[PDB]
Amino acid sequence: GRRRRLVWTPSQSEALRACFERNPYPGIATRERLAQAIGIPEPRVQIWFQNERSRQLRQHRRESRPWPGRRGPPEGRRKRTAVTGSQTALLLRAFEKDRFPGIAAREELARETGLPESRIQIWFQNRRARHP
DNA sequence: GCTAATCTAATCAACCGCAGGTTGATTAGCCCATTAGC
């Protein structure tokens, strides 16, 4: 079981396209401001930006056009989330039982450890690809 | 089918120390990443 997917509104899509036409690689500041402006969480904005970059690269692949890429100085990234030893131990205990936790498991871990669900999913994806 | 959510692999970068391991954050995926709600 995974997360229930998101459904877009016309104004949300217009804002997403208007923000992507200016900068296809937005920092955490622009992503959070746009998410605050459209009524969806910032992880959803980041996921949509990644998927839009993937589709634009695929489209430049279809049309055999070169992709511009990084233009201008890169914006600031998200500040690294500090995870304590207790939260790390709890995440390791949950990782031994299930390597691929569902949406309910991630929500429960977020309500417990206090870390965002997106950060817990990032930690799980980094832990699966580093501890066989 | 369309596209968000998810996975893995590779890589950049903060952290702590005063060098380079460790782990979180970012990006790309090339019989055009895969899988599953809408």
How is chain A split into domains, by residue range? 3-79, 80-132
Q: Phi first, then psi: what are they for A108, rounded to 5°?
A: -65, -45
3 state DSSP class of A7: coil
Half-sphere exposure of A56 (CA within 13 A, CB side): 15
Find, among A32, A52, A51, A27, the residue nearest to A43 by Cα.
Answer: A32
**Cβ atoms A61, A72 nearer than 8 A:** no
Q: Which nucleotide is nearest to A132 (CA to C1')?
A: B8
| Gap between the Cα atoms of A2 and A26, Å rounded | 26
Method: X-ray
**Cβ atoms A120, A109 nearer than 8 A:** yes
Helix axes A85-97, A103-113, angle to 10 degrees: 160
From the CA of A81, how many Å to the C1' of B33? Answer: 28
Question: Tokens 């634009």 label which residue?
Answer: A56
Question: Tokens 């501890």 label which residue?
Answer: A131
Q: In Å, how far are A81, A104, A123 from A115, measured between CA atoms?
A: 8, 15, 11
Q: Which residues contact A110 (CB under 8 A, 6 or more apart)?
A: A116, A117, A120
From the CA of A69, how many Å to the C1' of B29? Answer: 16
From the CA of A72, how many Å to the C1' of B5? Answer: 30
